[PDB]
Amino acid sequence: TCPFYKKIPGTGFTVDAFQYGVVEGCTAYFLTHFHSDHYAGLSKHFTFPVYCSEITGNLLKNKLHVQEQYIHPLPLDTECIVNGVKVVLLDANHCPGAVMILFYLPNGTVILHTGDFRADPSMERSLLADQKVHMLYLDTTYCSPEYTFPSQQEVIRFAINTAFEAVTLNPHALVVCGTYSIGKEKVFLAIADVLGSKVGMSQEKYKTLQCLNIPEINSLITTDMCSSLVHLLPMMQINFKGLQSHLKKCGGKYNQILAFRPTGWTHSNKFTRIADVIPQTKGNISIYGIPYSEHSSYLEMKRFVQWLKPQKIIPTVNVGTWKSRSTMEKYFREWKLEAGY
Ligand code: NI
Structure with missing residues (x-):
């Protein structure tokens, strides 16, 4: 009822x-x-x-x-x-x-x-x-x-600057961004734009993005993973095990992952500034939780x-x-x- x-x-x-x-x-x-x-x-x-x-x-x-x-x-x-x-x-x-x-x-x-x-x-x-x-x-x-959380523009500035620094230091680094619904597309689009890359993804996610009337979308996304250095994966795969497994699949093209999890609010918001955010790291994998809110x-x-x-x-x-x-x-x-x- x-x-x-x-x-x-x-x-x-x-x-x-x-x-x-x-x-x-x-x-x-x-x-x-x-x-x-x-x-x-x-x-x-x-x-x-x-x-x-x-x-x-x-x-x-x-x-x-x-x-x-x-x-x-x-x-x-x-x-x-x-x-x-x-x-x-x-x-x-x-x-x-x-x-x-x-x-x-x-x-x-x-x-x-x-x-x-x-x-x-x-x-x-x-x-x-x-x-x-x-x-x-x-x-x-x-x-x-x-x-509390920052403006969407401050969060995107952090993500772009973090990704561009890492990939310029190491051209063999892959960037991965998590997703499980529509929303938050600016995260992966802004990072791919600073890197001069299309975003690569599954056929199911490409289909979804093709429904969204985003201007010039055909210029920004692809299902050809090999041509792309920003990949999208399900949010459930954004952990050390899931990311290790993905790096195996890339045929020795890459030797490092930098990954983003756009969450809503997390209690690390009650102490830390966006500027001060640090990743969780294991070996050649680093994972950033970024407080990108759509509420x-x-x-x-x-x-x-x-x-x-x-x-x-x-x-x-x-x-x-x-x-x-x-x-x-x-x-x-x-x-x-x-x-x-
Ligand atoms: Ni909603």
Whole structure:
């Protein structure tokens, strides 16, 4: 049974609700982005209308085989009528194709569902500037002040400088980057660009990247591993055993690996600066964990909500424990008393 925080009141709509069977009353199923916890349940046998971005709809058709007649892609930043209700899709600053959804209810209530997002001051000049929001369905993944991490630009500067130094010292070093979902493509694209290389990968991952409308992608990626000195591997293989095994496969072309694991937050964030980050090393293998986040830090989240001034907040993450729920409710009240709404 579908939980209440996935239902939009006064509509026939649900958000990220595909694992509950046929939801009673639902006339349109929205999908905010192509991450498995959100699309869980979708397959080629799905026969209800799915509303989403163009990029999400490319992935639904090619990766999950959803039939075309049930995929309804909407352009961003554009007022659209769905089953009698005005909606707008906004860029969520998450992974490729990820959206927030503005719903203009027939009774005058306005609802924002963030999906998964990384709040940014640029959102204060989107179509959100133009009217009041009564209810906010909020990605609360990092809703606690211990969750700090650097800008995406600082993290990419660290990765590029680390990779270019290592490979210039040793032209026989291979760079490997972990992945297990879409998102975070800047990590491996920025490193391959500084090295003058395409990124090499499996046929399955190439297929996925080909759905993402990235400009000039054919110039940046390949399935020919031998021609590439940046390789992508499943995140589960980013360990000393998995990397040793991969180096064996490269036919004595390389004699060193430098590997990156883009994580979200880790408690090494509470002490160490990005500048001071060091790898784990065994022999000719070194592994860097880099804090590249596609979710809001605590401070970014607080700024967004204090700007928007919603009348009611419904969290969509960390909702399963009483302790998490009570923590989140306390911070919402602080924010509201501090700003005066
Ligand atoms: Ni996500």
